[PDB]
Design goal:
2 helices; about 90 residues; GMP Synthetase, Chain A, domain 3; alpha+beta; elongated; monomer
Length: about 90
């Protein structure tokens, strides 16, 4: 029982908004919906499409990175709000 110092929310929120500008450029924008002991839930959104083929790849990309940079999770619900692409 240390202290309720800048908890995860602060960090994630902090790093998120920081990387946001970069994510928007390539992927989109992330949004934390709920912080749990493992059953976290966020929402990705780059714009508004219908069948994103790139977001799917990126999705698994971030997830993997998160788990790797944060081993101990059990599940994560990342709901994307669509994000089509110019072409290819």
């Amino acid at each position: 029982m240390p202290t309720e110092n800048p908890t995860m929310f602060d960090q994630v929120a902090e790093v998120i908004e920081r990387l946001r500008p970069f994510l928007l450029r390539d992927g989109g924008d992330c949004t934390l919906v709920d912080v749990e002991d493992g059953i976290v839930k966020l929402q990705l959104h780059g714009a508004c499409g219908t069948c994103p083929s790139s977001t799917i790849t990126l999705k698994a990309g971030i997830e993997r990175a998160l788990h790797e940079e944060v081993p101990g999770v059990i599940e994560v619900e990342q709901v994307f709000l669509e994000h089509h692409h110019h072409h290819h």
